[PDB]
Design a protein around this ligand. Structure first.
Ligand SMILES: Nc1ncnc2c1ncn2[C@@H]1O[C@H](COP(=O)(O)OP(=O)(O)OP(=O)(O)O)[C@@H](O)[C@H]1O
Ligand SMILES: Nc1ncnc2c1ncn2[C@@H]1O[C@H](COP(=O)(O)OP(=O)(O)OP(=O)(O)O)[C@@H](O)[C@H]1O
Ligand SMILES: [Cs+]
Ligand SMILES: [Cs+]
Ligand SMILES: [Cs+]
Ligand SMILES: [Cs+]
Ligand SMILES: [Mg+2]
Ligand SMILES: [Mg+2]
Ligand SMILES: [Mg+2]
Ligand SMILES: [Mg+2]
Lengths: 326, 325
């Protein structure tokens, strides 16, 4: 096999360990020769055996090479940026790879930045006619103006793995929840809490003609789908396909493929939905979904007849068929 | 306090020559020690004296160092990216500076990529309640669907300096206008042409919560505010403050700062407006406006009491206020 892929995992985001968990899942199944590069939590890079060493530790606090790393970029045909969250999924790493001229897996700069921002993405989706949960954006220092009644969900505008997210019951608790989210981002969203709710997720694969995976449902007993529930094995109940009627599942896939085109995503995406009182709401769209043992995106496509190595192979091919079209 | 600025100009976008003119304006008024780095049209970088030599030539087709350049970044305290257009104003260069850790003038990755897309910005601004011109997006290869009557304006979605823009009077001319636009971007926008139209411009300075300049109005005798009109001296008149009705100036400034806040722009932006039949429309936000001799952003704030050196001082200063957060 002549194809050579550079996998980049880790990062300075709070999802650093999740990224390393995703690297292990991709390295186990990718059918091409693949080297790993790890971004440590201090921003410095680890290469070669030191990157594989940090992968066994499932955490990399300190690195060796400051950015830009002395990496032989001409060795690799495709770069796989497996960096969840800030400085990896928000367009920053994508912009660096665009200047290197390398083909890379996943969405481009604008689509990565647009989808990581829980406020700007909802504005675009609401403008295209996609149903979303009522919300408002709160900037740091600016007092909150919430035109709907609690319960709320307070999130950092650019977050992942449910980090910094709080379920708020009384308006008294809003200022403390906003202060937690402001630890992770200068901007936060306050969303109306759907109670009760079912959580549905669909994977999308493709550049121009994206195709949807079967609809899956996630169930749990924690207050919400939080960090511990997402990544502790066995804590989350992953139901594929979702025990819904076919009509709702078809509508979920229709909405996912539409949001995929509206937001300009290419490569891949996991689209999360809320089902409450028969009404569908698009929650978010993740351009670099997790590939951890408890993650949903790889399982969603295996049920659809696309095995784990076939999914990763099509991700790498899509990065090349997009690059050739300039 | 020590302050050494690295100025980056040139670039691979069609506005390459315009960027070098902006660098000459910035270097003539910036109050800090400032080195120049030139990105040639081939993507390779020119450093030091070769960057100054290419500045005198007003064009740099070929460069020396492939990306990333062997630049001594540690020598500089703020990076001033002055690259108009794609690969400079659209978040790509900003992402490299973020990973670099050096503070930089202007909008971040998200705000740059959003303002540089004439379709994405209009989607966000229309949802936020900002009035915008009726528009539609066309992808290269897809057949267009323009649900409104001509005249149109056809634009590359990522264009600047009126490059690739056509005024379309007949439907039989749409195909040629799209083929022209698709030379510069894989996505194009088709907008309902306002005729007649007055053009208003207002500058913003600040991080997210901006400070608005006086409103200025551009006059010209060309068919539209095209490339030759934008950069040939004397072809464009700037009337400050714009001859506007009571409260109309305030409304323009309110919309400018509102779009600035929604999109979360940092540093600066020039916000362009259309005035047609008493109605206001938001045209675009340019995060890296021109600093060329005929550009309006320094003149808008000069009329507001912020001189050219003070304007550049606050821009460098705002880059550190965000970085120190
Ligand atoms: N409006 C809401 N109503 C009910 N529950 C919500 C709402 N918003 C968020 N939640 C709960 O909080 C969890 C996290 O929400 P969200 O998907 O925004 O977090 P995230 O970190 O972006 O997720 P991911 O890890 O997929 O990126 C959801 O799985 C859901 O269970
Ligand atoms: N919808 C419209 N109706 C009427 N005139 C228009 C319209 N769109 C563009 N124009 C004319 O074309 C010119 C350029 O439009 P636009 O500002 O979109 O180009 P640009 O390349 O973004 O300009 P800049 O150099 O400010 O970036 C405008 O100044 C205006 O004169
Ligand atoms: Cs996201
Ligand atoms: Cs809203
Ligand atoms: Cs713009
Ligand atoms: Cs539209
Ligand atoms: Mg998410
Ligand atoms: Mg989620
Ligand atoms: Mg512009
Ligand atoms: Mg303009």
């Amino acid at each position: 096999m002549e194809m050579r892929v550079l996998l980049i995992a880790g990062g300075v985001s709070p999802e650093h360990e999740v990224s390393l968990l995703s690297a292990e899942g991709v390295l186990r199944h990718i059918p091409f020769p693949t080297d790993l590069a790890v971004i440590a939590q201090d921003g410095r890079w680890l290469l070669g055996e030191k990157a594989l060493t940090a992968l066994e530790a499932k955490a990399a606090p300190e690195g060796e090479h400051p950015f830009p790393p002395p990496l032989s970029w001409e060795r690799y045909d495709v770069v796989f940026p497996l960096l969840h969250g800030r400085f990896g999924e928000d367009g920053t790493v994508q912009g660096f790879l665009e200047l290197l001229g390398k083909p890379y897996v996943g969405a481009g700069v604008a689509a990565s930045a647009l989808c990581m921002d829980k406020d700007l993405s909802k504005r675009v989706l609401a403008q295209a006619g996609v149903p979303v949960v009522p919300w408002v954006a709160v900037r740091k220092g600016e007092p909150p103006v919430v035109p709907f009644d609690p319960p709320f969900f307070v999130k950092p505008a650019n977050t992942g793995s449910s980090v910094g997210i709080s379920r708020v019951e009384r308006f008294q608790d809003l200022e403390a929840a906003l202060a937690l989210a402001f630890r992770y981002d200068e901007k936060a969203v306050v969303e109306k809490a759907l109670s009760p709710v079912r959580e549905l997720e669909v994977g999308v694969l493709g550049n121009v003609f994206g195709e949807a995976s079967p609809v899956g449902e996630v169930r749990y007993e924690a207050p919400f789908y939080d960090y511990e529930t997402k990544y502790t094995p066995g804590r989350a109940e992953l139901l594929i396909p979702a025990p819904l009627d076919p009509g709702t599942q078809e509508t979920v896939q229709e909405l996912a493929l539409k949001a995929y085109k509206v937001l300009g995503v290419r490569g891949m995406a996991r689209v999360d939905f809320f089902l409450a009182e028969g009404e569908l709401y698009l929650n978010e769209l993740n351009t670099i979904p997790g590939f951890t043992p408890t993650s949903m995106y790889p399982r969603l496509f295996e049920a659809g007849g696309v095995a784990y190595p076939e999914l990763l192979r099509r991700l790498v091919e899509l990065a090349l068929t997009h690059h050739h079209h300039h």
